[PDB]
Amino acid sequence: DSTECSNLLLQYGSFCTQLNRALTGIAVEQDKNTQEVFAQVKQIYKTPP
Amino acid sequence: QVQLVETGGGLVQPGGSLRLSCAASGFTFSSVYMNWVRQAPGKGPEWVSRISPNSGNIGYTDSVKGRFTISRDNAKNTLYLQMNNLKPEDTALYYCAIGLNLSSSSVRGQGTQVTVSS
Amino acid sequence: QIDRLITGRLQSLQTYVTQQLIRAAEIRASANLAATKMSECVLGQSKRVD
Amino acid sequence: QIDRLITGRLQSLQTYVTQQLIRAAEIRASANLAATKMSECVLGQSKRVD
Amino acid sequence: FNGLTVLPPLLTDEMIAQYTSALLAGTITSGWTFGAGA
Amino acid sequence: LTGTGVLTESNKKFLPFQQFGRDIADTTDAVRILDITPCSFGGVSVITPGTNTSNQVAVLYQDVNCTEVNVFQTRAGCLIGAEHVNNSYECDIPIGAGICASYSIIA
Amino acid sequence: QCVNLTTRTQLPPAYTNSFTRGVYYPDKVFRSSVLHSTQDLFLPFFSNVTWFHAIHVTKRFDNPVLPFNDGVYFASTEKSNIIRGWIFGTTLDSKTQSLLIVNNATNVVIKVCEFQFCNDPFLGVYYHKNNKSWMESEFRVYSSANNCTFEYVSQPFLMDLEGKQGNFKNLREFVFKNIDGYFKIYSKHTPINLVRDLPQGFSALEPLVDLPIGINITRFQTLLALHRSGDSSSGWTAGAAAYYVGYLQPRTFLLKYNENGTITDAVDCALDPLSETKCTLKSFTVEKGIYQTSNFRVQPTESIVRFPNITNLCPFGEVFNATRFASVYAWNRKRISNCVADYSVLYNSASFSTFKCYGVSPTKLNDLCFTNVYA
Amino acid sequence: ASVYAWNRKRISNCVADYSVLYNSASFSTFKCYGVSPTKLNDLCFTNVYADSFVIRGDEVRQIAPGQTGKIADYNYKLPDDFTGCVIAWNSNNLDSKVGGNYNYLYRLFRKSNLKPFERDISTEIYQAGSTPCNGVEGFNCYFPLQSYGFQPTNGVGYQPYRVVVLSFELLPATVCGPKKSTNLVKNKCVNFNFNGLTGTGVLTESNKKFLPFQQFGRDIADTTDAVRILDITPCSFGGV
Ligand SMILES: *[C@@H]1O[C@H](CO)[C@@H](O[C@@H]2O[C@H](CO)[C@@H](O)[C@H](O)[C@H]2NC(C)=O)[C@H](O)[C@H]1NC(C)=O
Ligand SMILES: *[C@@H]1O[C@H](CO)[C@@H](O[C@@H]2O[C@H](CO)[C@@H](O)[C@H](O)[C@H]2NC(C)=O)[C@H](O)[C@H]1NC(C)=O
Ligand SMILES: *[C@@H]1O[C@H](CO)[C@@H](O[C@@H]2O[C@H](CO)[C@@H](O)[C@H](O)[C@H]2NC(C)=O)[C@H](O)[C@H]1NC(C)=O
Ligand SMILES: *[C@@H]1O[C@H](CO)[C@@H](O[C@@H]2O[C@H](CO)[C@@H](O)[C@H](O)[C@H]2NC(C)=O)[C@H](O)[C@H]1NC(C)=O
Ligand SMILES: *[C@@H]1O[C@H](CO)[C@@H](O)[C@H](O)[C@H]1NC(C)=O
Ligand SMILES: *[C@@H]1O[C@H](CO)[C@@H](O)[C@H](O)[C@H]1NC(C)=O
Ligand SMILES: *[C@@H]1O[C@H](CO)[C@@H](O)[C@H](O)[C@H]1NC(C)=O
Ligand SMILES: *[C@@H]1O[C@H](CO)[C@@H](O)[C@H](O)[C@H]1NC(C)=O
Ligand SMILES: *[C@@H]1O[C@H](CO)[C@@H](O)[C@H](O)[C@H]1NC(C)=O
Ligand SMILES: *[C@@H]1O[C@H](CO)[C@@H](O)[C@H](O)[C@H]1NC(C)=O
Ligand SMILES: *[C@@H]1O[C@H](CO)[C@@H](O)[C@H](O)[C@H]1NC(C)=O
Ligand SMILES: *[C@@H]1O[C@H](CO)[C@@H](O)[C@H](O)[C@H]1NC(C)=O
Fold it and tell me: How the protein is affected by changing residue 25 to D (chain F)?
């Protein structure tokens, strides 16, 4: 929450966008990992009573 | 660039009251008052007199009571120093400064040397 | 001074992101292995030893 | 001033090369998987499920 | 509090448990056939 | 000591010799006694069905309980501009915590 | 001499919506086939702009003096060249410099001088029934011009001066900025077949002129022409015309450049969440999905100070004005605490040859707190 | 002009030869910020801003970006990113007269620090107290201007110094120094200097349309691609 530092870093380049993109990619990759591991079957089977 | 153009003071003989005019330009005068200061060869400056803009009180050193007065005019925007019983010891530089309570090493003009010629 | 601090904190954040990327690659390899195990061990009978 | 510019640009290039290496590792894993699929399903019949 | 936040996973633990339950029930009832079709 | 935040009454016990109070990370948390809490903040994401389809969008405020700020609450924050339905379809646009959205925009 | 105009019924001000207007080339650098993000004073999209009329049908001869905050977008839908110029200044009373840009029937005049503008500046065209002829006759703008700095006059020409029958057939758009001591005028002209309310569409304003005047502008007014053919203050006609005034604000825009190097579309970057996501993705079209665009934050409301109760002024008198000080090898040391130190007086003493402050600024030292001061 | 009324002049549409100024050796200070003093003969700018005034020698230091001082704060403040050059030369023999030259005046008191290149000609009396004196200078309200009072025998610190600050801004070129032009060559990797814009590459006739107000066209990476129309191409390079 410092406007002066914000101006300084936007004058420093565009590293923040790259870092945010990398982290977002990691997050979507984690979601994909869980989906691939567990969601192999498209039908929910119920064990008989 | 405020210019404190002051009228020169020629040699005057004793017996006639001497008038010394002092003008200025480049700034409002009715709001700011001016002080007359006397400087001599061999000694430093000496605050002589002041006049207020509104109250118009002529205040000057006790050692000079009764022989110096000032008259300001806003219409022509200048001052006139009147001195009677002028004596040779009045040989002086009577310069003007923008009036202030301290009146110490403030803005001042180049002044004119005025001496009473016996 | 703020530029000194900015350089330091950018370096720290880049180090963190790089380490996180490597760790995420490792976890993705593990998740692919787990998906293979689910496909073969669970949804079928595996002939692969151990 | 050139020291400043070199520092910045070299940092950017190092970053780019780092994520380039990580992406290359990911692609190498994918290529190994593709080669395994070619060997075990084009050159033969696979009993592995899914 | 310093810009570091944790996003929630898309699949809640309840849904992951439901997936595992479906897989296990299919395995018990059918074995391997449910992975090759119906 | 300059800062920005919300001052609240504190249950913590400052001994007579203590002035400031720091939590982990060495960031000031209480000052002589008042607890300091950062003003509510978070991320802001836009869920869109694609400008090709429509320009209507929904806004997700993340990690924000927007009782402060078609409002709908979710474990990932709160979503504004999407109608919450009791049906269940395949996940089109993943929001998080088992909530998904699709195209009016429904969640 | 100018005479105050009468016979003008008073009506409340009107407002209109500006749709995708007030866009200009931020810089004179050629770019083609690129989406460029620029932060500068622009007119926000879908904004509200004040609408001023000139219609006979009251006679609605409106030309109020308006403020000039950070720039102005000035549109005009007309068919008879009613508007002719503008005046800019801070007082418009000959006390300070004022700028005038007039376009009389013969030449385009630009002056930067001290005018005693009266309350109803304007121009007047007299139509002669004996022979069909329209020519400017009345020039009632200012009363004096004492100290004039910048002068410019274009080569002579002769306008139409004729009031045409039909809807508005010309749209003139201007943008005026007072930046870095320069007065930048951007412009565009467009054909129109429309009655009122600022046609939709998109068009970039190319730079027209950059007058190096370097003055302090805070207010302006428009100068327009009336028609005559009663008293000077009652015997006048307005003539159909409309103009629109909008105010610029500092915004970030995403501009699309065609392969010809011209701006053909833009995104406001703050109008809507969709505009913001387009702006962050650097594309004018975004596919389906969820994109983390911005950060929600709550700005502070008030400001509070909790400095100590002590009111005992710190005793710097014996530290500065003391008669005697020790030698350098035996430098005298004094302790200052439990008092209130007023550093403004020390800084403003003006008798200090050097006041070199290290680690802390010379100013901004009047609001800091210390456990100790060693003198 | 007095410092409190430092006088600023515009220079454009001419050729400025700075070599004579550099080698004159009559300037006490020739301190150039952002530009090397012996490097302006090949460069050129849109315009030159010459701000002239007079100060004390000891005060020449205060005329610099990011420098804190009475004059630098309330008479003439340069921007932090100032580009230009400050020239200061002693004028004791031309400005000092017996009896005290009080013609030079400088403003001292002001409520707020001046913005860069902000000239203040206000004659208002500084108010140092809660009670306003309504323009009648008195207790806690003082005249904000003081006189130098230069003397012929004053020391170097108190001796007068005339200062000219040349400021440059680059936003087409108008005033370019003494560099002889050359005939244009196309289809050959050459070094080129277009209005002070330096580069190397091949210049070819271009078909892109520049609007009358445009001078040079820049592609991605902020590297100039076309210049007044001429296309610039990096001449052949590769790996071996
Ligand atoms: C138009 O009206 C204005 C005020 O509505 C007049 O302004 C007056 O101008 C005279 C000198 O020109 C001043 O002495 C008055 O003090 C002004 N009036 C006010 C209220 O300030 C102006 O003169 C009029 N012009 C005409 C009738 O031609
Ligand atoms: C643009 O600005 C005008 C400024 O007048 C707005 O009109 C006013 O809006 C406020 C509340 O928004 C009302 O209280 C006023 O009564 C309105 N003025 C009048 C004369 O009625 C206007 O709403 C803004 N937006 C648009 C689209 O015009
Ligand atoms: C429009 O304005 C221009 C410039 O203000 C006028 O041109 C001047 O006219 C006067 C009177 O005829 C001449 O003395 C000047 O020499 C002209 N200056 C030029 C041409 O630069 C012009 O006359 C005005 N037109 C009308 C109809 O008033
Ligand atoms: C431009 O002129 C305006 C006057 O309209 C200045 O604003 C005034 O500034 C003085 C300070 O000298 C204040 O006392 C007034 O209250 C201000 N009035 C208004 C209406 O703003 C403004 O400061 C000037 N700006 C520049 C850069 O010269
Ligand atoms: C939206 O997508 C469909 C796909 O069939 C296409 O036909 C249509 O032109 C698209 N609309 C826009 C505005 O691009
Ligand atoms: C949000 O706040 C309200 C009251 O302010 C509370 O009832 C609700 O439980 C909160 N939401 C969550 C997810 O805790
Ligand atoms: C349908 O959903 C709403 C919330 O959007 C809920 O309040 C309501 O109870 C639901 N209907 C049911 C459970 O029948
Ligand atoms: C004829 O037109 C001229 C201008 O073209 C005008 O000066 C003149 O007054 C007109 N005729 C009469 C009788 O007024
Ligand atoms: C401004 O006008 C006055 C009166 O006309 C004049 O004395 C003064 O010289 C002018 N200022 C200039 C020319 O800079
Ligand atoms: C300029 O734009 C027009 C579209 O209005 C297009 O037809 C023309 O081809 C463009 N210029 C060039 C050189 O292609
Ligand atoms: C500070 O002074 C005020 C006014 O007397 C008083 O109310 C307050 O209690 C004081 N603060 C203390 C004693 O901490
Ligand atoms: C020393 O005395 C002068 C004159 O009374 C005064 O202005 C100054 O403030 C004093 N010194 C300090 C440190 O206050």
Answer: In strain: Alpha/B.1.1.7
